[PDB]
Write a protein that binds this ligand. Structure first.
Ligand SMILES: CCCOc1ccc(C[C@H](Cc2ccccc2)C(=O)O)cc1CNC(=O)c1ccc([C@]23C[C@H]4C[C@H](C[C@H](C4)C2)C3)cc1
Lengths: 256, 263
């Protein structure tokens, strides 16, 4: 039966490569040098990187924060497409699918964001740039503790040294989470996740024979993720309840 | 079912199960026996309202909510003591840096308390006073605005957690896994802790596979529940800040207060 598992794993990987442009393997090469990105480490760096480079993603801290949103909206579409390739997903009650993506994207966003971060910064805009971790903490208002929580998570998560083939199955497990509120038919979901969990388990055993109980440690990071999301939602509302320069075109705000 | 490695894991499971029974007076087996009525001597007095509560004082401050609340404070202080005792039995635990021992307990006792509290719960209520009493979920939710719902989140977790059908021998290892968490804030030497947890994780994994052959991916499902515990703790901690402000006259046990400080 270990046949259908290896196939599911290969399938998810191929699909993951297709849905996500910047893989971890590719991002890693750019972060260590073995392979250059424009560096944003201070205000003038920023102003220049967006001047020469047309970073598709008023006030700096605010403009940076909104670029994060723009990029997140973009990531949501990639994740949605990926999900549809997971065997059984499209066959679930349509409302449940929306529910699963609705509560799952944030967890996946931060999970994948770690692939693009090291302890010194994060790759932005397809990796054409590198925004410094220090510069992010240099932001005033509450925009200073905005990204820090993610870096800390990334340092820990990256310590597991997973690769794209590992992450592809993990993401699918995050998506098929049967405890999301509002699901109408939980069984099919948990049934698919169970199969995905089996696939992830064999994947990690064969890909990291020397890493003891890596499956357990990866599942434990689940705790870390939701805490990051919950905390994120809190700072997000604090930005809505306060801040008056967050004004965007009516059509734009609707887009988020 | 072979090698000396799997043999060491079974030995560890037995050691942990043996300590768990020795450290916790009210096991899940005894709790289930009382709840399911497979007795004529283990039947609890049920408290589902005020007069019941009143009549229970005889069978088993000044206010309904606060009295019930102070009771839970006392009981969990006692639980922390039992948990602390169980912790010393975990191989390697007492050999770790003394500060880390305190840190691990500080972050693990509540997650463990709610894990074990589920053993004493069903969709309708919870056992109290070593199983002599039973307070229904509805009575506890009818309480005054503040306390009126400090328990509901525990019930919601319990009915789902109990769905895994774990038994004491399973819980003994899981409780151990929880305590030996290398990602606790402020830990000095994270390596020795992770090494102990890895071995506990192996013990738990084998135990579940052997105890629940037909329960597919129980191990992973059990681990995912850990996120549920953290959440319970945060909510509870926030509900306490609310109470200590609305009820300026209600005291909170020092031990429990030192555990929430800078949590
Ligand atoms: C009432 C059911 C509640 O049963 C709970 C609920 C939550 C906890 C966890 C605590 C709550 C807390 C939250 C905030 C701070 C600290 C801890 C925690 O998280 O630390 C423990 C118990 C276990 N409780 C019992 O077994 C139990 C035994 C005796 C009584 C009486 C108290 C008093 C009135 C009645 C008659 C006498 C005198 C006995 C009932 C009540 C409860």
């Amino acid at each position: 039966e270990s046949a259908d598992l290896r196939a599911l794993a290969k399938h998810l990987y191929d699909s993951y490569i297709k849905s996500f442009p910047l893989t971890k393997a590719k991002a890693r090469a750019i972060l260590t040098g073995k392979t250059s990105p424009f560096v944003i480490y201070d205000m003038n760096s920023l102003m220049m990187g967006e001047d020469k480079i047309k970073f598709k993603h008023k006030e700096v801290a605010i403009r940076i924060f909104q670029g994060c949103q723009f990029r997140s909206v973009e990531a949501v579409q990639e994740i949605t497409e990926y999900a549809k390739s997971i065997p059984g997903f499209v066959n679930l009650d349509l409302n449940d699918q929306v529910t699963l993506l609705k509560y799952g994207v944030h967890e996946i966003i931060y999970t994948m964001l770690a692939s693009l971060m090291n302890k010194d910064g994060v790759l932005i805009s397809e990796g054409q740039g590198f925004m410094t971790r220090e510069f992010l903490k240099s932001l005033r208002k509450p925009f200073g503790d905005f990204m820090e929580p993610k870096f800390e998570f990334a340092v820990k998560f990256n310590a597991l040294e997973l690769d794209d083939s590992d992450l592809a199955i993990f993401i699918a497990v995050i998506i098929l989470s049967g405890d999301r509120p509002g699901l109408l038919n939980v069984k099919p979901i948990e049934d698919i996740q169970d199969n995905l969990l089996q696939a992830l388990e064999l994947q990690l055993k064969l890909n990291h024979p020397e890493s003891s109980q890596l499956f357990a440690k990866l599942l434990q990071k689940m705790t870390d993720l939701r805490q990051i999301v919950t905390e994120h939602v809190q700072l997000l509302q604090v930005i809505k309840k306060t801040e008056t320069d967050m004004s965007l075109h009516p059509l734009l705000q609707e887009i988020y």
